Amino acid sequence: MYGFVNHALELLVIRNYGPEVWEDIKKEAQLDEEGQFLVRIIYDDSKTYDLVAAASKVLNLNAGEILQMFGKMFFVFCQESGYDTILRVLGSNVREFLQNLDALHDHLATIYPGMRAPSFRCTDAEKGKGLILHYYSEREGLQDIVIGIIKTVAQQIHGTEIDMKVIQQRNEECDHTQFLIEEKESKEHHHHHH
Ligand SMILES: O=C(O)CCCCN(CCc1ccccc1OCc1ccc(CCc2ccccc2)cc1)Cc1ccc(C(=O)O)cc1
């Protein structure tokens, strides 16, 4: 886990709960000696999962909850910072966001060096209302992060209600985690009333 999102995780606890609560969890995650949280440090993914596991005790909010509220915070925080860059990159909307993921992979890497491995595909399961996001990554439980970001930019920006559910989990049986995105444009396009 690169220090950017790792520091954003720290940020989540400090802001929404409190700095006092943060240091309590920091004790439990056995990360009392590690408070750098810088982008080039690259914290072990294990330390991130164990961190949220500790937060699941103190906050009582389970990993899935923390990861989703992380995505929510991440979006609103960036826009709150007043960075107009979020309005330019990723088209500032769900559709562009999804397909521009690999775009920031290269574009933002030129500014912040560091190996970023993107392996993902988006093919609908013969329905349209079911984009199968083929997510190839070892952090299978980091799925809720995607959920918390994508749904937020969808209905809040584009006004389109979409839901992403994990239909396949990376394990020994399957090297890939698959998501299904059910987009409801019938909420907007099917308003033939006046
Ligand atoms: O496998 C995985 O995790 C994902 C594999 C696909 C690439 N993955 C997309 C995540 C993503 C998925 C869906 C939607 C939006 C997403 O982007 C959210 C996002 C993530 C990170 C930053 C800070 C960037 C930064 C990094 C350093 C300095 C400055 C800026 C910004 C925004 C990016 C990524 C790559 C490697 C690592 C790692 O290795 O930890 C972690 C994440």
From Swiss-Prot:
Q: Which UniProt keywords apply?
A: cGMP biosynthesis, Cytoplasm, GTP-binding, Heme, Iron, Lyase, Metal-binding, Nucleotide-binding
- Record-listed heme binding positions: 105
Where does the entry say this protein is expressed, by tissue? Detected in brain cortex and cerebellum (at protein level).
Q: Name one GO cellular component term.
A: cytosol
Instruction: Output the Gene Ontology terms for molecular function.
Output: adenylate cyclase activity; cytidylate cyclase activity; GTP binding; guanylate cyclase activity; heme binding; Hsp90 protein binding; metal ion binding; nitric oxide binding
Q: Just give the chief location class.
A: cytoplasm
**Keyword Nucleotide-binding annotated:** yes
Q: Which GO terms describe its biological process?
A: blood circulation; cellular response to nitric oxide; cGMP biosynthetic process; cGMP-mediated signaling; nitric oxide mediated signal transduction; nitric oxide-cGMP-mediated signaling; response to oxygen levels
Q: Where in the cell is it found?
A: Cytoplasm
Summarize the protein's role.
Answer: Mediates responses to nitric oxide (NO) by catalyzing the biosynthesis of the signaling molecule cGMP.
Instruction: Please give the subunit comment from the record.
Output: The active enzyme is formed by a heterodimer of an alpha and a beta subunit. Heterodimer with GUCY1A1. Can also form inactive homodimers in vitro.
The entry sums up its family as follows: Belongs to the adenylyl cyclase class-4/guanylyl cyclase family.
Misc: There are two types of guanylate cyclases: soluble forms and membrane-associated receptor forms.
According to UniProt, the name of this protein is: Guanylate cyclase soluble subunit beta-1
* Organism from which the protein derives: Homo sapiens (Human)
Lineage start:
Eukaryota, Metazoa, Chordata, Craniata, Vertebrata
| Covered residues, full protein | 1 to 188 of 619
